[PDB]
From a paper:
The small molecule caspase independent lethal 56 (CIL56) induces a unique form of nonapoptotic cancer cell death that is promoted by a complex formed between zDHHC palmitoyltransferase 5 (ZDHHC5) and an accessory protein, golgin A7 (GOLGA7, also known as GCP16). ZDHHC5 is one of 23 mammalian enzymes that catalyze the S-acylation (“palmitoylation”) of hundreds of proteins in the cell, regulating protein localization, stability, and function. The family of 23 mammalian ZDHHC enzymes is defined by an Asp-His-His-Cys (DHHC) active site motif.
Residue numbers in the entry:
A (entry chain B): 6 to 125
B (entry chain A): 17 to 265
Write the structure that this text describes.
């Protein structure tokens, strides 16, 4: 299994410190992955992380429940961000097995990289 | 090595052993709500702040990011909210330190969003434990205020004599609260200011930001929301390792 190189995607920072990556298509990936599907997958992954962050009423309710129960609800039930990570992990596995593998690419979970750079 | 604040618990247990059993026959009936729940909250928050990963980045190994650095001054600038911030090419941690985080020197690690390091907390405060530490401080100052403002009943209703027996138990806790309230109140008010502003600790230390500063100031209520009722982050280190799929052509 020969390896050619690695490309890192910096995080999008115009929005702020939220966990969205720079969607701009890197020039190294020409003819390996098209711009359209890379745009699609990065947009969906960023949407998933944004959904993991949303300050909706459910986040307020889970915070209140954790405060009342002395946070033991974390031990019994995984946090919202963790289940979103599970879902996005499933997403990246199916994307890798359906698009990148025939194109000779593979994607790793950014959580292994600390949500800093995604490695292809 | 380093030790925690055992004496703070020792002051509280004075109330637990004998301070107000059986006084509520003609006065204030509902006893525990004043101190017991506050002590449990303080203990839980303090423990979860002490033993918990605060956001240790996973020690980025070599061959990381870009190796085209020939003689760069080891800082790349990003303009968040249109305002530039200067981050640093960390040497041992081996990555760019995304904005609003730094090293910890004595802690020997380089972390995510950094607040402060202290031996009393035994660690450095990131953002995973920032909510826990903030509620710990708020609950602790609430506990001290409640003691010094209402638990003094056992003397305040007590007539001149107050002669020994169990009064000496309350004798010391009064001066303990008096000596300990001012520093903890000042420090928790400090952190309250640091929460009201989108700007914390080392950012106070930097006497250079004058003008279009604090790009991540957000909107006050939004800051309290994200620090109190946001979904907790997961640990960036020690997650189980996956496995490869195929040779991939
Ligand atoms: Zn570092
Ligand atoms: Zn530290």
């Amino acid at each position: 299994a020969p390896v050619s190189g690695k490309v890192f995607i910096q995080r999008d920072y115009s929005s702020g410190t939220r966990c969205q990556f720079q969607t701009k298509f890197p020039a190294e990936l020409e003819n390996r992955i098209d711009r359209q599907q890379f745009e699609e997958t990065v947009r969906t992954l960023n949407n998933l992380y944004a959904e993991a962050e949303k300050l909706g009423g459910q986040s307020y309710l889970e915070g209140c429940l954790a405060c009342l129960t002395a946070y033991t609800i974390f031990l019994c039930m995984e946090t919202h961000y963790e289940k979103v990570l599970k879902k996005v992990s499933k997403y990246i596995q199916e994307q890798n097995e359906k698009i990148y593998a025939p194109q000779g690419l593979l994607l790793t979970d950014p959580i292994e990289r600390g949500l800093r750079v995604i490695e292809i | 090595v380093s030790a925690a604040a055992i004496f703070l618990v020792g002051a509280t247990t004075l109330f637990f052993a004998f301070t107000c059993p059986g006084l509520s026959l003609n006065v204030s009936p509902a006893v525990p709500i004043y101190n017991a729940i506050m002590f449990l909250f303080v203990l839980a928050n303090f423990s979860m702040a002490t033993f918990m990963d605060p956001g240790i980045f996973p020690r980025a190994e070599e061959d990381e990011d870009k190796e085209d650095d020939f003689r760069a001054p080891l800082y790349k600038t990003v303009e968040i909210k249109g305002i530039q911030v200067r981050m640093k090419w960390c040497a041992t941690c081996r990555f760019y330190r995304p904005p609003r985080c730094s090293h910890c020197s004595v802690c020997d690690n380089c972390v995510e969003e950094f607040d402060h390091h202290c031996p009393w907390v035994n660690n450095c405060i990131g953002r995973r434990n920032y909510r826990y530490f903030f509620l710990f401080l708020l609950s602790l100052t609430a506990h001290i205020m409640g003691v010094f403002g209402f638990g003094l009943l056992y003397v305040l209703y007590h007539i001149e004599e107050l002669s020994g027996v169990r009064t000496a138990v309350t004798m010391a806790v009064m001066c303990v609260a008096g000596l300990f309230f001012i520093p903890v109140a000042g420090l928790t008010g400090f952190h309250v200011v640091l929460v009201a502003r989108g700007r914390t600790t080392n950012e106070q230390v930097t006497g250079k930001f004058r003008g279009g500063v604090n790009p991540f100031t957000n909107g006050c209520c939004n800051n309290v929301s994200r620090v109190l009722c946001s979904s907790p982050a997961p640990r960036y280190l020690g997650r189980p390792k996956k496995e490869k799929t195929i040779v991939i052509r």
